[PDB]
Amino acid sequence: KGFSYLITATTTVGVAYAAKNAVSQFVSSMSASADVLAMSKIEIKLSDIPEGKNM
Amino acid sequence: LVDPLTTVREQCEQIEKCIKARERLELCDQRVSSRSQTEEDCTEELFDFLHARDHCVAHKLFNSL
Amino acid sequence: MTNIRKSHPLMKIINNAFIDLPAPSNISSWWNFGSLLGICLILQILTGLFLAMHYTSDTTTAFSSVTHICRDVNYGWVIRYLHANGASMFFICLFIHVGRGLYYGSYMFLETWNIGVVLLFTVMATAFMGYVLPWGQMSFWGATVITNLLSAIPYIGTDLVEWIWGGFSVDKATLTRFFAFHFILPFIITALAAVHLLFLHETGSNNPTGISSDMDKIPFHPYYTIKDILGALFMMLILLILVLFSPDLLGDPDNYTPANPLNTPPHIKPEWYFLFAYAILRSIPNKLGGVLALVASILILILMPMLHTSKQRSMMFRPLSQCLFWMLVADLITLTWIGGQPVEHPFIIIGQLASILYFLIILVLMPITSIIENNLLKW
Amino acid sequence: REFGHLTRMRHVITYSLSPFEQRAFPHYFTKGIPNVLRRTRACILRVAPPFVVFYLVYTWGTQEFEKSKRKNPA
Amino acid sequence: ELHAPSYPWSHRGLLSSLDHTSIRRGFQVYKQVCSSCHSMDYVAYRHLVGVCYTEEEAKALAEEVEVQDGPNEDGEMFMRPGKLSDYFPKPYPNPEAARAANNGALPPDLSYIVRARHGGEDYVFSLLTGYCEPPTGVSLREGLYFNPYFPGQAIAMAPPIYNEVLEFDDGTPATMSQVAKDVCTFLRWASEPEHDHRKRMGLKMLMMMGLLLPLVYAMKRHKWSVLKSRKLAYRPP
Amino acid sequence: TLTARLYSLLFRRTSTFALTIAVGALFFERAFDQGADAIYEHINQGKLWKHIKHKY
Ligand code: HEM
Ligand code: HEM
């Protein structure tokens, strides 16, 4: 019973890995795409703005 | 500066496929220039020569690049 | 007390379709491609819906929307080429599935065979309208040729082509309505597949011997769920080899060029799974005769039960008709190759002989040869 | 159509083993290889000749087509 | 029809990735030779981070260009230094100015040029290196150049690459064939920027299939051994 | 034997079978990704950004 059931366990383990990857990728496509992370994310700058200046 | 492609092309031109195609091309070049007004063209002959040369050159060129 | 698997109204249907269904104990790997088809369908609905989360069907953005899917959407290239090569896998499985039906006489199940013909047409329409959606050169000009084919129809051809376009040519309205139809059609395909399985389960599966197998039925669940899982894993292997090692093997580079109504491509071919028909239509000089032949090459599947002249159901015990079947498969391969080629010498006469031979096999050679086999067996 | 009412069958005995008592790949090569070769000889002259004909037709059509794009001196 | 040869690219192999130093040198070739007449609409500066340039290097490369930016408080359009999120500059405002500048020919966008050609980077390499003199009997209009790999063998692009056409930052001689190989590697990345990830996923998939397929096959055959070793006897009256 | 012990301890009950599968899935993901990545970066050694980044 061990040997046979070992084959199932390993099989499930492999399938688990595969399943996760597939699902993960489909979940990340609904995550903010690269361009969205690029534009709306940040607009950092240095002290280029002078005193009393509303840039 | 010297380019690998020049020397690779000469070496591959020393190939008998190239050697045969080159004089096929030069017999076309001897005809089409002798005949005063024709529709040929030696593009097919050059295509044979270039096919052979460039097969050899694609075998040997990226090793020096 | 009851077993809710057998008593519960939903679980009863599921149980009778995939668990306690009596199945022939000897159906081969060729009987796997049903379960592959339904899996392909699901995959196409899954990736396409995720493509439809980013795709836009305006002609100013469709090609750009697809580039965005493949370049900036997380794993969007995976979903995109999984969808494209899953369409190719869908058609591979469909052709193998119909070939199995032909070889083993499965068309003697009239209702499920006829529903299968309907399904073949609907999958073809879905794939055709989906391929226009990227709005590449091949998208545009393939839509152009295939839709203007319908002008050959007498008295209403131009009116119906213009109505399908929604305009004077293939343009924005055509792309948007093709997106809508491409979205809706696979769900109608799902309903038709359910009706298909409903009609099949009335008799159960045919087997490779062609002999009724009721004395040797096994339960579906342990045996064919695991066998169908193995077949699905093998299909996934081929699909992922395509997606991850040659994404562009079965496609065309000219669809990476945005559609140019001013410039036409040197070659305008459908996809590979249309070429056999594109050959047949291109073999006939007459526009309308060509369209009628391109339609008859798939409507002729409706005629197989009436063309059956053998005392036996399947091809397992009929060498001569196996010979003709493999000639038919070879003729379909040569029609695909011809349809991928220009209309020039010698592919024209080859396509003509192949187009004649396809119909001459199905309609004439196969019936006469079954009759000869009948007499060789003294019945 | 359900188990228990499919046919009448009589005088047929079946003997089976548990899957945990037997192997899943017994004689997989010593018997499987001769079986594949037998199954290949049984069908090869029914399947192969059409594809040989396609290979020849494809080869001829391609070489001929390319033999038309060549300049014929004239 | 002169078809391109098959060159032994570093990325041709099934698990073989692109050489990213060639991608960097090829960006330098595109951004110093091609860009004056070709656009790359679908490749932005940010895309080059983690591929052939660091974020600081790519931000300075974006700073090197000026890009038009949207309306001001007064409603005018202005010019600002480029950004990572900015796409590559377009050399021509519209297709008609591109055709006007190039003797009627529109030079294509190169984001997908490798994918949109039969023969790919092999074709592009042979096209860039394949300018010869026209053969006897072939005459081309002025502003056209004989290239045996271009369909029709009459191309409106003059030979762009030559020896020492640019300088390479890592010091490579910029021989014509070197420049062509570098730019062709860059164009392969610009068409398929998932190439390396795609092949790493392919390696993982092949390993997982080599594990699961034997295992699922063993599962199927464990369940089926009941049927496959089965014995039948017929004992009629 | 070892497989007798594995079955008696971890496979006989379905809950413990499933727990073994879950823990094994976690550790397998880690080790398999580590090995496959090392193979891919050895095949493509010196060609990747990571190998060359430290110059820029
Ligand atoms: C939407 C695509 C289709 C799906 C999902 C589908 C699904 C299925 C499934 C699951 C089976 C049972 C398993 C099997 O025997 O393979 C089956 C059997 C069958 N299908 Fe299909 N099918 C489709 C298209 C077709 C087509 C195009 C035809 C032919 C015109 C067809 C005709 C049949 C026949 C005749 C059977 C019974 C085969 C037999 O038992 O011998 N189906 N189908
Ligand atoms: C019957 C199943 C389906 C088939 C056969 C099919 C076929 C196709 C094909 C061949 C393409 C072109 C792929 C390419 O770009 O090369 C495509 C594109 C597309 N399909 Fe489908 N499709 C199916 C189901 C669906 C469904 C259900 C949806 C929506 C939920 C969908 C959404 C899309 C989208 C958005 C595109 C454009 C993106 C792209 O080109 O990749 N598909 N389809």
Automatic annotation (TrEMBL), chain A:
It is found in: Membrane; Mitochondrion inner membrane. It comes from the Eukaryota. Belongs to the Rieske iron-sulfur protein family. The Rieske protein is a high potential 2Fe-2S protein. This is Cytochrome b-c1 complex subunit Rieske, mitochondrial. It comes from Sus scrofa (Pig).
UniProtKB/TrEMBL annotation, chain B:
Disulfide bonds join 12-18, 12-56, 28-42. Residues 3-65 form the Ubiquinol-cytochrome C reductase hinge domain. It is a peripheral membrane protein. It is found in: Mitochondrion inner membrane. Keywords: Acetylation, Disulfide bond, Electron transport, Membrane, Mitochondrion, Mitochondrion inner membrane, Respiratory chain, Transit peptide, Transport. GO terms for cellular component: mitochondrial inner membrane; respiratory chain complex. GO terms for biological process: mitochondrial electron transport, ubiquinol to cytochrome c. It comes from the Eukaryota. The keyword Transmembrane helix does not apply. Belongs to the UQCRH/QCR6 family. Component of the ubiquinol-cytochrome c oxidoreductase, a multisubunit transmembrane complex that is part of the mitochondrial electron transport chain which drives oxidative phosphorylation. This is Cytochrome b-c1 complex subunit 6. It comes from Sus scrofa. The chain holds residues 26 to 90 of 91 of the full protein.
Automatic annotation (TrEMBL), chain E:
Residues 21-122 form the Cytochrome c domain. The keyword Coiled coil does not apply. GO terms for molecular function: electron transfer activity; heme binding; metal ion binding. Keywords: Electron transport, Heme, Iron, Membrane, Metal-binding, Mitochondrion, Mitochondrion inner membrane, Respiratory chain, Transmembrane, Transmembrane helix, Transport. Heme c 1 binds at residues 34, 38, 117, 123. GO terms for cellular component: mitochondrial inner membrane; respiratory chain complex III. Heme c 2 binds at residues 38, 117, 123, 156-157. Binds 1 heme c group covalently per subunit. Heme c binds at residues 34, 37-38, 157. Its cofactor is heme c. It is found in: Mitochondrion inner membrane. Its main location: mitochondrion. Component of the ubiquinol-cytochrome c oxidoreductase (cytochrome b-c1 complex, complex III, CIII), a multisubunit enzyme composed of 11 subunits. The complex is composed of 3 respiratory subunits cytochrome b, cytochrome c1 and Rieske protein UQCRFS1, 2 core protein subunits UQCRC1/QCR1 and UQCRC2/QCR2, and 6 low-molecular weight protein subunits UQCRH/QCR6, UQCRB/QCR7, UQCRQ/QCR8, UQCR10/QCR9, UQCR11/QCR10 and subunit 9, the cleavage product of Rieske protein UQCRFS1. Belongs to the cytochrome c family. This is Cytochrome c1, heme protein, mitochondrial.
UniProtKB/TrEMBL annotation, chain F:
It is a single-pass membrane protein. InterPro entries: QCR9, QCR9_sf. The keyword Signal does not apply. The keyword Mitochondrion applies. Its main location: mitochondrion. Keywords: Electron transport, Membrane, Mitochondrion, Mitochondrion inner membrane, Respiratory chain, Transmembrane, Transmembrane helix, Transport. It holds the Pfam family UCR_UQCRX_QCR9. It is found in: Mitochondrion inner membrane. SUPFAM superfamilies: Subunit X (non-heme 7 kDa protein) of cytochrome bc1 complex (Ubiquinol-cytochrome c reductase). GO terms for biological process: mitochondrial electron transport, ubiquinol to cytochrome c. GO terms for cellular component: mitochondrial inner membrane; respiratory chain complex III. Belongs to the UQCR10/QCR9 family. Component of the ubiquinol-cytochrome c oxidoreductase, a multisubunit transmembrane complex that is part of the mitochondrial electron transport chain which drives oxidative phosphorylation. The complex plays an important role in the uptake of multiple carbon sources present in different host niches. This is Complex III subunit 9. It comes from Sus scrofa (Pig). The lineage of its organism: Eukaryota, Metazoa, Chordata, Craniata, Vertebrata. The gene is UQCR10.
